[PDB]
């Protein structure tokens, strides 16, 4: 079988970057790593939340 993948969402409230993006991953920690890399790549340095009920991460600057 192929692994079950979940679509995770990132809500971004940055100084210059704002909106939402998504990633697919087998677990939340993998999605978190992808989103933290994306934020780093775009110069976003904020604080984060993760809601396991909605599979949504939020970062605010």
UniProtKB/Swiss-Prot annotation:
It is found in: Secreted, Cell wall. Sequence repeats lie at residues 7-61. Binds to the constant Fc region of IgG with high affinity. This is Immunoglobulin G-binding protein G.
């Amino acid at each position: 079988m192929t692994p079950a993948v979940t679509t995770y969402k990132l809500v971004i409230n940055g100084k210059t970057l704002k909106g939402e993006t998504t990633t697919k991953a087998v677990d939340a920690e993998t999605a978190e790593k992808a989103f933290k890399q994306y934020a780093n790549d775009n110069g976003v340095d904020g604080v984060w939340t993760y809601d396991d009920a909605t599979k949504t991460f939020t970062v605010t600057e």
